[PDB]
RNA sequence: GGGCAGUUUGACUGGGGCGGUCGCCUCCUAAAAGGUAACGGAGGCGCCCAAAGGUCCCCUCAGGCGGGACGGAAAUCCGCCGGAGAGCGCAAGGGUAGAAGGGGGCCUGACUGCGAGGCCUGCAAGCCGAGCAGGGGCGAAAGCCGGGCCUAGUGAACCGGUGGU
RNA sequence: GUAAGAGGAGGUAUAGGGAGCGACGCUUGCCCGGUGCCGGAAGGUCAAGGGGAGGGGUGCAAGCCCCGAACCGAAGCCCCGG
RNA sequence: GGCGUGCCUAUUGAAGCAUGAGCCGGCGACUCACGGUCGUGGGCGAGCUUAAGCCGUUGAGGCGGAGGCGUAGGGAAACCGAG
RNA sequence: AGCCAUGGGGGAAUCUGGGCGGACCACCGCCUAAGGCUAAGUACUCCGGGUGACCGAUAGCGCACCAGUACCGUGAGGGAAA
RNA sequence: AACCUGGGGAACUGAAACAUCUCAGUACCCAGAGGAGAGGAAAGAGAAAUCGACUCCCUGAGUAGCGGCGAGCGAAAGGGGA
């Protein structure tokens, strides 16, 4: 699948890849947004 | 007659022979697996590309069971 | 018959709507070292009256070298020229619009 | 008479004060997906051409 | 809606057509640098993984023989022998246990901002990367981390879709 | 033939157009799934238009200006049958 | 007596049994405008230069700075500026 | 995608009016549609004159000459030599 | 003769195919005009609380921009002059 994670409390993004079927229902991994430094992200 | 294929030759091998001045961080050896290894001031990356971590001269040592390494001795 | 090299891609966006080019001032860069030649109270007028301008209306005396202890009326200075020049004589900003 | 600046040219190339044709890097706008950060960065650059570079300067000049 | 109109209707090719093929990886042909052709000899790719990634720690095969309730040539167990004939997602090759292989813990550097110097190269493109800054991760520290042992897993540009500044 | 019109025909289905076979004798079989043609007040799909829940731009406002869901919309095709 | 395979063209290859020409004479094919990019001969130089025209000339040139190229670049732009 | 022009449909106002300033709204500015005429500068070269680092009879117009003739073609038309 | 305005309006061709595009509103057909023709007293231009009918030359300028953003196409104000 084609995926791009978004930032909480904001709207940052990054390149990524989903897999759907296989163990990939939830997706909340950490990153390094621009506005400030370091927060959590999502799926869709 | 399915048989007219081949692979774009990747042009591998060594690129800097022992006794040769190499600039800061240029390439030495592009190899398949581990025909060679790092050595005094000789890092490498994903494809197994040996290069220099400084300037200096390239040299080839042979350590039987231990394999073959290629390092650089600098001058400063 | 392949593709020239028209593979290089447009970036020069803001290339043009349909009306086109907008009515905007056009400040003219000109080194004060090229000014300090002749002397007196230099203005845009006295500047084009020479050979550096060609009616860009807006002038922007700037650059390096040795300014002169003169008055240089202009449409825009540089924080560089400004100070060297303060260390020389005087300098009036633009008129207005 | 009075050659026309190739429009499709200037819309994607700029010629520098020196005279070397700077061009925009290709390979970023579509192939993308998860191209290593190291990828889409080293692509954000501009750069130089070479022998076609001299074909280019031929297409403008009034500019 | 061939009544009528403008056109398209690929190339390679021991003529052409039929057939087959067209890009990418592997080996050979390739004549011990690289390069190297033929409708030459043989195969693979259009993917896959949040564990198959990171890092610290720990452990090392296949095979054989001997014994061992089921089992039975081969499950699992132990003894003994076993430098790699295993494994390493998938073709091949090089490579590898002095780990890149196998298990566990914590984690997500499948980072942002640049890039010294080179590899390759007609162009375009592809490729490798020391190191700096910020902010982190595993580790006592040294350190290591810009995805996977690596080499296929792909598409200039134009024209458009959604988000923000 | 752009049209006016003209042929058709100053003919009227025992007629005119198109089609195929081709004196005359004996005959001309089964298949309607595909296609064509014919038929079918439903239904599905379907354009312009109609409709204006909702919302956009703007103005101090009145207002102005735009986007637009439900619903209503023919042939056509889909569907049934010859 | 010795020696000796026409011409052009086209070609891997021609005396060629490949092309073209019976012969002679005349005609016959890389030009010009505008804009480039080299080179070159000059003039002027942080400047260089006019276009149309106006006046004059009847083969006489001159005035005409509009404009143009040049002096600052970078950047998609806003902007900044030997950055 | 404004403006000018207009095939089709709807359809004002008389200056507290209408247009335009690049979809649109507000401000601010420009302007008077839906009537009409106007010299000059401009193009041209059958015609006359001047001149040529234009031709000199296979050139120069096709035609230096009784040539758009002879001659060819039904015809349009073509078209010499000298 | 040519030039001019309006009514109509090609394809080759270029895009190294070819539809949009180009060739081009050219060729040609038609009607009308005169020594010219057209154009013309701003519902203008467009950013200067500014220029001020029209026509043409120079310029602006291969610029703004248009374009299967390909081939290619190509203005206006302003300035200089008639």
Curated annotation (Swiss-Prot), chain A:
Alphabetic keyword roster: Ribonucleoprotein, Ribosomal protein
BP GO annotations: translation
A GO-annotated cellular component: ribosome
GO MF, one annotated term: structural constituent of ribosome
Record bears the keyword Cell inner membrane: no
Signal sequence interval, chain numbering: none
Taxonomy, superkingdom: Bacteria
Family membership: Belongs to the bacterial ribosomal protein bL33 family.
Protein name: Large ribosomal subunit protein bL33
Organism annotation: Thermus thermophilus (strain ATCC BAA-163 / DSM 7039 / HB27)
Taxonomic lineage: Bacteria, Thermotogati, Deinococcota, Deinococci, Thermales
Gene: rpmG
Whole-protein residues included: 9 to 52 of 54
Swiss-Prot record, chain B:
Key words of the record: Ribonucleoprotein, Ribosomal protein
One cellular component term from this protein's GO annotations in UniProt: cytosolic large ribosomal subunit
Residues of the signal peptide: none
PROSITE patterns cross-referenced by the UniProt entry: RIBOSOMAL_L27 (PS00831)
InterPro entries, alphabetized: Ribosomal_bL27, Ribosomal_bL27_CS
GO biological process: translation
A GO term for molecular function: structural constituent of ribosome
NCBIfam families attached to this UniProt entry: L27 (TIGR00062)
Family label: Belongs to the bacterial ribosomal protein bL27 family.
Name of the protein in its database record: Large ribosomal subunit protein bL27
Provenance organism: Thermus thermophilus (strain ATCC BAA-163 / DSM 7039 / HB27)
UniProtKB/Swiss-Prot annotation, chain C:
BP terms from Gene Ontology: translation
Domain of life per record: Bacteria
GO molecular function, one term: structural constituent of ribosome
TM region positions: none
Assigned keywords, A-Z: Ribonucleoprotein, Ribosomal protein, RNA-binding, rRNA-binding
Gene Ontology terms: cellular component: cytosolic large ribosomal subunit
Family: Belongs to the universal ribosomal protein uL15 family.
Subunit structure of this chain's protein: Part of the 50S ribosomal subunit.
Cited function: Binds to the 23S rRNA.
Protein name (record): Large ribosomal subunit protein uL15
Organism in which the protein naturally occurs: Thermus thermophilus (strain ATCC BAA-163 / DSM 7039 / HB27)
Part of the whole protein covered: 54 to 150 of 150
Swiss-Prot record, chain D:
Record GO biological process: translation
Gene3D superfamilies: 4.10.410.60
Keyword Ribosomal protein: yes
PROSITE patterns per record: RIBOSOMAL_L35
UniProt keywords, alphabetically: Ribonucleoprotein, Ribosomal protein
GO CC term (a single one): cytosolic large ribosomal subunit
Molecular-function annotations in GO: structural constituent of ribosome
Alphabetized PANTHER family for the sequence: 54S RIBOSOMAL PROTEIN BL35M, LARGE RIBOSOMAL SUBUNIT PROTEIN BL35M
Family (UniProt): Belongs to the bacterial ribosomal protein bL35 family.
Name recorded for this polypeptide: Large ribosomal subunit protein bL35
Organism: Thermus thermophilus (strain ATCC BAA-163 / DSM 7039 / HB27)
Lineage: Bacteria, Thermotogati, Deinococcota, Deinococci, Thermales
């Amino acid at each position: 699948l084609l995926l791009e994670c978004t930032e909480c409390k904001r709207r940052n993004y990054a390149t990524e890849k989903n897999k759907r079927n296989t163990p990939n229902k939830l997706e909340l991994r950490k990153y390094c947004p621009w506005c400030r430094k370091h927060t959590v992200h999502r799926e869709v | 007659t399915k048989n007219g294929r081949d692979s774009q030759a990747k042009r591998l091998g060594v690129k800097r022979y022992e006794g040769q001045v190499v600039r800061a961080g240029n390439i030495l050896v592009r190899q398949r697996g581990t025909r060679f290894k790092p050595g005094k001031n000789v890092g490498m990356g994903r494809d197994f590309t040996l290069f220099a971590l400084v300037d200096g001269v390239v040299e080839f040592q042979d350590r039987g069971r231990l394999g073959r390494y290629v390092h650089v001795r600098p001058l400063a | 018959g392949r593709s020239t090299t028209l593979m290089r891609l447009p970036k020069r966006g803001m290339q043009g709507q349909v009306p086109g080019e907008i009515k905007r001032p056009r400040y003219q860069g000109v080194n004060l070292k090229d000014l300090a030649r002749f002397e007196g109270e230099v203005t845009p007028e006295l500047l084009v009256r020479a050979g550096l301008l060609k009616k860009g209306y807006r002038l922007k005396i700037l650059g390096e070298g040795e300014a002169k202890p003169l008055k240089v009326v202009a449409h825009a200075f540089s924080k560089s020229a400004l100070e060297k020049l303060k260390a020389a004589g005087g300098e009036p900003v633009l008129l207005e619009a | 008479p009075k050659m026309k600046t190739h429009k499709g040219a200037k819309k994607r190339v700029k010629i520098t004060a020196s005279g070397k044709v700077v061009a925009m890097k290709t390979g970023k706008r579509h192939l993308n997906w998860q191209k290593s950060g190291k990828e889409i960065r080293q692509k954000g650059r501009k750069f130089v051409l070479a022998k076609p570079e001299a074909e280019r300067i031929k297409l403008l000049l009034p500019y």
